[PDB]
Design a protein around this ligand. Structure first.
Ligand SMILES: Cc1cc2nc3c(=O)[nH]c(=O)nc-3n(C[C@H](O)[C@H](O)[C@H](O)COP(=O)(O)OP(=O)(O)OC[C@H]3O[C@@H](n4cnc5c(N)ncnc54)[C@H](O)[C@@H]3O)c2cc1C
Ligand SMILES: Nc1ccn([C@@H]2O[C@H](COP(=O)(O)OP(=O)(O)OC[C@H]3Oc4nc5nc(N)nc(O)c5nc4C(S)=C3S)[C@@H](O)[C@H]2O)c(=O)n1
Ligand code: SF4
Ligand code: MOS
Ligand code: FES
Ligand code: FES
Ligand SMILES: [Cl-]
Ligand SMILES: [Cl-]
Ligand SMILES: [Cl-]
Ligand SMILES: [Cl-]
Ligand SMILES: [Cl-]
Ligand SMILES: [Cl-]
Ligand SMILES: [Cl-]
Ligand SMILES: [Cl-]
Ligand SMILES: [Cl-]
Ligand SMILES: [Cl-]
Lengths: 173, 316, 730
């Protein structure tokens, strides 16, 4: 019969170092805030249901899927997208490694791969274990087995995976 | 997704009070199940109350020598916690066996317990599903049932509870700590937390209107060998076909709980006591009451063989 | 340029830049989030409205009414587009199912309306208020149930019969008779189908995600009933396709319709849950193979019949064609049978016909080899055919299947395999090795390009060819750089716009070869125009180091353009060489797998592909194609299935969770070897396709590996643990 009107609320985010002041529909995901409200289109929408990781971003340094969090939940948060890591004439080391190893084909998963991979190396350094960590009490090592598992939340239908792994191991050493 | 008002409050007491005062209100934590369901208008709350940032995110030793895990603790942080890794390893293993890094970073203790079925007929609102619409039918019963429950089912619904962390909580005799909107507290043992589908599969847990889970309490550590074996069609980022959580002591005794087989984590205390006798005996007790479809019958042999594999791991 | 005789020596043969593993030139854009896909062109329409689709809630029947009042009244809503209010439409030649349904409903999630609104959130919420009313009709949804009633081929696709199959089968010393099924599969391109439409009077500009720009323009125009010259298609970056974006889908139609009705730009993305039933799928198959061989292991009889299903007038899955060419045999039978099913439209997916056909054929060969007592590598080598088995006078242009296999076996350590299945363990895992042949034809199609020498010495390539993740941008730049003697980094390449010359597009794995050959043809004209500007003879001139030399005479490319820029526009056309010779491409797929001895979980431990696909234009981006295709092959083998509900008539698991594709954790070491397969019968580039070849055979290699690990044949893909569990050890 009917659906209710947008609830509009002010919102402050810090995106790639820059203070943004928005008025958003409460329903708006962080993903759509970046792409549609702020026109930062580098973050991609593969599924909108947390199944693909193409919308991976950093929120206060921790990777998450922007499609399954609300913008208004991160009032005053530091958001980092693919655009914040680097740009064509000042490539981040990871971005550059990906080019060198051909860790992408279509490019649609690639933002997400890159944001995850940078946070994954950080998680290993921080000593966060994984599904493949044999000894749970001791600190995890930066192995190929570990990276694969920790990256399995970023889906590449192009199947660039083997090259993505080579890019990450390169940037890690 | 229907438009909703969004509230931040100062205390957990305020959060539960607001949930009573506002019809259709729901709590949001990580949002990793709730927002998924809201996009499809399977959940359609008029009001969201943010329960992050209310101090419900600590992991603490209890006075009894156990652990009190806050409801809002992230799954990554729970699994990474030092005490949990040494003293409650099977919890850490079950957490890490599920979802993705991105998802585990936002998902919370309470949220994870309250995650809803992944039944694909449930997720499709053009299909018959008693859980979503009572009396409309269960499309899965004679449709695609490969990943549905084999035990504790009814004619009305054959959905599995998808949580790996809940299988490990059930093994540890975990207790869900709440506050009612009235302001009184309740302890619900996780064994009594999930209702069977019966003729009301739309009724899923023992929580009341606007009742807020504040923590999950674990008892003192058991020691022993902790294992979480999760079987799935691909290597990662998938729900369990079948999962076996086990804690095996040096003399062959222990406890086990299974996931992927029922509407809740599946553990029978009579069956725990037969571990030293082998996987065959344990299985026969666990699955005496089983009622599979043809498509998910394989889960029964999978459960038994996975369990045997787990016990053989413990001997080595 | 008409290419109707084999290529001799030409400038591409120097291989200063062609043939070399260059970084892809769109890399800086794609790794920094600055490449723009269809839904992301904000500056081109910054007040663009949002269109949200309503799919059919039934598989089949009549749409008796469609109510839109509640949606029209909802917050921020501009209009609801429906079949009723959109006006009489045409249908494009590549659409079997209508893109806008009503009154007839042809399949589940067929688009029936579009709510246009001010924001995305408002359009989605408003779409939930659209109330459709249906009368169901009886449908057919089970390919296996329709099988029994279909035993003639289509009128326009008769069976192919050579020698006496039935006689030779009876007389054969050793033989197999086996049935294989493959399921319905889905593209799952990571970019959902999207488009944005802007009208300027009668002129339409569509930003979209499409593999075939010219087909898009033509079919959109035919559908809208507008002059084709009034429509412009723009798709420079496509986030994957895999066959699923070869045709006009309902996002492009509905964006166009919406934008004209509301007199404002409108953008439309098909939501992910809607894609698998709304768009197309690889048809399921059901395949019957009977193969006979003599005392010495020489195949004497081969029969391959395949059953597939589709909507009336839809395509069969062409699963038997490879069996007409791949192995020797004097006595042959092939046949398609096409059922009518009321599922969504079956259509092309990566290696249509060949992927499922080899999924069956290459297990069947494995089985027959086993029965003959012969190593499966040797069995295939023994039955190599260097000519068309149905027409011995007709040679393969170039066929290196033997070499692929031998090279593969040597690199892989195939001799280490245990021929008796089930005997190798690594802890709790049963280890297996398996092999399969890949095969895919080389198709030729006309393709054009425009190439400019600019006054600052840079080179500009324009063509409507697409780069869907293949690397077209990069190989086209290499082609022009090679021809004009400039370094790669001085070549601009502009793709995927209908205001550029018509290319063959990204499809049939003809794209690399056709598109670079068009550039070759333009660059040959440009070299001629350059030669003429500095008073040199084209025939005796060479192009290197940013200069043109002609015996003792020598000018710089700066001087040629002093009198304005030089522009050449040309097409390559292909004559009767693909009739005179059989042009195909070949591979050897070697896999090691692990099967868990308790749970039956299958994990690929090691994969090698050895390919022969003409001259490789870029070994890096070519290797990527094949490891990509290997990954897709793993999915087809182990996890990918669109689960049909026979009662309700749709794909049940219609999303990125329920339809399991491979993840990082699944991926073993993946090695690729390209044999030097330079084929001068193909084109002046001497190239042939890899993008679909690389998938061909992969799944059966894996199936044959699982067999070697376990002793268990599974002929119904995918090979999931439930199919293995009751036959494993204890
Ligand atoms: C692609 C994908 C794969 C996944 N795979 C796995 C897997 O393999 N294994 C597995 O276990 N899980 C898996 N999950 C599920 C994931 O673990 C859960 O979604 C997550 O645990 C939910 O936590 P949350 O905090 O985000 O809850 P929310 O989404 O915030 O909320 C969920 C429910 O809890 C309520 N709620 C939240 N907090 C409280 C509180 N304090 N008191 C009362 N009610 C509350 C909400 O109103 C709601 O009904 C997967 C999810 C996705 C998207
Ligand atoms: N001998 C030449 C042959 C091709 N290639 C490499 O491979 C690509 C493939 O070209 P080719 O095999 O002609 O295939 P197409 O250009 O025709 O592209 C289509 C083809 O592309 C494949 N792979 C693709 N991978 C991207 N990531 N996403 C797609 O949708 C896919 N679509 C499949 C399918 S389906 C098909 S038909 C080049 O761009 C180049 O990097 C070159 O290096 N060696
Ligand atoms: S199983 Fe439970 S959830 Fe799945 S459809 Fe039948 S009722 Fe709805
Ligand atoms: O012909 Mo490939 O695009 S299915
Ligand atoms: S768009 Fe966020 S996970 Fe796919
Ligand atoms: S690069 Fe195409 S999806 Fe990963
Ligand atoms: Cl780094
Ligand atoms: Cl009911
Ligand atoms: Cl057993
Ligand atoms: Cl190079
Ligand atoms: Cl009916
Ligand atoms: Cl050889
Ligand atoms: Cl030259
Ligand atoms: Cl090389
Ligand atoms: Cl290389
Ligand atoms: Cl499913």
């Amino acid at each position: 019969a009917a659906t209710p009107a947008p609830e509009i609320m002010p919102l402050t985010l810090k995106v790639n170092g820059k203070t943004e002041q928005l008025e958003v529909d409460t329903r708006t995901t962080l993903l759509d805030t970046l792409r549609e409200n702020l026109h930062l289109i580098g973050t991609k929408k593969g599924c909108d249901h947390g199944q693909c990781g193409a919308c991976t971003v950093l929120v206060n340094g921790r990777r998450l899927n922007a499609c399954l969090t609300l913008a208004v939940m991160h009032q005053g948060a530091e958001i980092t997208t693919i655009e914040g890591l680097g740009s064509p004439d000042n490539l981040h080391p990871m971005q550059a490694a990906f080019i060198k190893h051909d860790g992408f084909q279509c490019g649609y998963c690639t933002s997400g791969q890159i944001c995850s991979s940078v946070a994954v190396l950080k998680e290993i350094q921080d000593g966060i274990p994984s599904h493949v960590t044999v000894d749970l009490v001791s600190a995890p090592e930066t192995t190929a087995d570990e990276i694969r598992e920790r990256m399995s939340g970023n889906i590449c239908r192009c199947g660039a995976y083997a090259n993505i792994l080579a890019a990450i191991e390169d940037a890690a050493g | 997704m229907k438009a909703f008002t969004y509230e931040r409050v100062n205390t957990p007491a305020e959060a539960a009070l607001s949930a009573q005062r506002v019809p259709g209100a729901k709590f949001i934590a990580g949002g990793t199940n709730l927002l998924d369901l809201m996009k499809l208008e399977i959940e359609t709350p008029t009001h969201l109350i943010d329960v992050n940032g209310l101090g419900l995110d600590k992991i603490e030793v209890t006075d009894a020598g156990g652990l009190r895990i806050g409801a809002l603790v992230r799954n990554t942080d729970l699994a990474a916690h030092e005490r949990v890794r040494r003293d409650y390893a099977v919890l850490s293993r079950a957490l890490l066996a599920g979802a993705s890094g991105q998802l585990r970073n936002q998902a919370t203790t309470a949220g994870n317990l309250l995650q809803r079925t992944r039944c694909p007929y449930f997720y499709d609102t053009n299909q018959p599903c008693n859980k979503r619409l009572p009396g409309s039918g269960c499309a899965a019963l004679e449709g695609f049932s490969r990943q549905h429950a084999v035990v504790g089912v009814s004619e009305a619904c054959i959905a599995t509870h998808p949580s790996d962390m809940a299988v490990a909580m059930r093994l540890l005799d975990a207790v869900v700590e709440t506050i009612t909107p009235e302001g009184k507290t309740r302890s619900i043992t996780l064994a009594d937390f999930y209702h069977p589908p019966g003729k009301t599969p739309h009724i899923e847990t023992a929580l009341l209107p606007g009742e807020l889970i504040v923590a999950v309490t674990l008892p003192p550590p058991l020691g022993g060998k902790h294992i979480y074996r999760k079987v799935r069609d691909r290597a990662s980022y998938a729900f369990a076909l079948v999962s076996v959580a086990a804690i095996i002591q040096p003399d062959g005794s222990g406890r086990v709980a299974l996931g992927g087989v029922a509407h809740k984590p599946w553990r029978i205390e009579a069956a725990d006591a037969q571990l030293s006798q082998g996987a065959q005996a344990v299985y026969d007790t666990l699955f005496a009451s089983a009622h599979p479809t043809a498509e998910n019958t394989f889960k029964l042999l999978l459960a038994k063989r996975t369990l045997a594999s787990v016990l053989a791991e413990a001997r080595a | 340029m008409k290419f109707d005789k084999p290529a001799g020596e030409n400038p591409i043969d120097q291989l200063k830049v062609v043939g070399r593993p260059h970084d892809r030139i769109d890399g800086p854009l794609k790794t920094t989030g600055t490449a723009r896909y269809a839904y992301e062109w904000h500056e081109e329409a910054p007040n663009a409205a949002y269109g949200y689709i309503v799919g059919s809630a039934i598989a089949k029947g009549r749409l008796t009414a469609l109510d839109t009042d509640a949606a029209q009244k909802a917050p921020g809503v501009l209009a609801v587009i429906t079949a009723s209010n959109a006006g009489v439409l045409g249908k494009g030649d590549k659409n079997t199912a209508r893109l806008l349904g009503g009154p007839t409903i042809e399949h589940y999630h067929q688009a029936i309306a579009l709510v246009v609104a001010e924001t995305f959130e408002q359009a989605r919420a408003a779409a939930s208020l659209v109330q459709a009313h249906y009368r169901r009709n009886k449908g057919a949804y089970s390919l296996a149930d329709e099988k029994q009633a279909v035993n003639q081929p289509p009128e326009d696709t008769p069976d192919k019969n050579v020698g006496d199959f039935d006689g030779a089968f009876t007389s054969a010393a050793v033989k197999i008779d086996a049935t294989y099924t493959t399921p319905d599969q889905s593209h799952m391109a990571m970019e959902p189908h999207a488009s944005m439409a802007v009208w300027d009077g009668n002129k339409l500009t569509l930003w979209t995600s499409n593999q075939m720009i010219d087909w898009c323009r033509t079919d959109l125009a035919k559908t809208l009933k507008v002059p084709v010259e009034n429509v412009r298609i723009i798709s420079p970056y496509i986030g994957g396709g895999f066959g699923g974006k070869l045709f006009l889908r309902s996002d492009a139609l509905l964006a166009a319709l919406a934008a004209r009705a509301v007199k404002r730009p409108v953008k439309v993305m098909l939501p992910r849950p809607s894609i698998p039933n709304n768009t197309t799928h690889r048809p399921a198959t059901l395949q019957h193979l009977r193969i006979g061989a003599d005392q010495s292991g020489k195949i004497t009889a081969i029969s391959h019949e395949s059953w597939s299903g589709n909507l009336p007038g839809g395509t069969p899955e062409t699963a038997v064609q490879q069996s007409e060419l791949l192995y020797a045999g004097a006595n042959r039978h092939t046949g398609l049978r096409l059922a009518t099913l009321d599922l969504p439209e079956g259509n092309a997916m990566r290696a249509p016909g060949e992927a499922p056909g080899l999924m069956a054929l290459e297990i069947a060969i494995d089985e027959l080899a086993e029965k003959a007592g012969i190593d499966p590598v040797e069995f295939r080598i023994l039955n190599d055919t260097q000519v068309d088995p149905a027409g011995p006078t007709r040679c393969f242009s170039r066929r290196q299947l033997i070499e692929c296999l031998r090279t593969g076996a040597d690199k892989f350590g195939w001799k280490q395999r245990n021929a008796t299945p089930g005997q190798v363990r690594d802890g709790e895992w049963l280890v297996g090795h398996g092999v399969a042949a890949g095969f895919h034809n080389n198709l030729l199609e006309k393709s054009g390009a425009r190439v400019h020498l600019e006054q600052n010495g840079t080179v500009t390539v324009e063509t409507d060819m697409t780069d869907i993740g293949t690397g077209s941008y990069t190989i086209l730049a290499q082609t022009a750089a090679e021809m004009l003697g400039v370094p790669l980094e001085q070549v601009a390449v502009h793709l995927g716009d209908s205001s550029f010359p018509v290319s063959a597009g990204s499809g049939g794995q003809w794209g690399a070869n056709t598109s670079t050959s068009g550039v070759y043809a333009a660059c040959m004209k440009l070299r001629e125009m350059i030669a003429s500007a500095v008073g040199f003879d084209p025939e005796q001139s060479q192009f290197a180091d940013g200069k043109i030399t002609n015996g003792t005479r020598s000018a710089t490319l700066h001087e040629a353009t002093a009198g304005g820029r030089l522009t050449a526009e040309e097409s390559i056309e292909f004559g009767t060489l693909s009739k005179e010779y059989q042009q195909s491409t070949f591979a050897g797929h070697f896999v090691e797998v692990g099967v868990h001895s308790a749970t039956g979980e299958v994990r690929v431990r090691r994969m090698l592909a050895v390919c022969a696909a003409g001259r490789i234009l870029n070994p890096k981006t070519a290797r990527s194609q094949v490891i990509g295709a290997m990954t897709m092959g793993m999915g087809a083998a182990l996890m990918e299935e669109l689960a049909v509900d026979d009662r309700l008539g749709y794909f049940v698991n219609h999303d990125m969770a329920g339809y399991e594709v491979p993840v990082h954790a699944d991926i073993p070491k993946q090695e690729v070897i390209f044999l030097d397969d330079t084929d001068p019968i193909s084109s002046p580039m001497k190239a042939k396709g890899v993008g679909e070849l690389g998938l061909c055979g992969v799944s059966a290699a894996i199936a044959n590996a699982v067999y070697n690990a376990t002793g268990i044949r599974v002929r119904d893909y995918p090979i999931t643990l439930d199919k293995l569990l009751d036959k494993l050890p204890d």
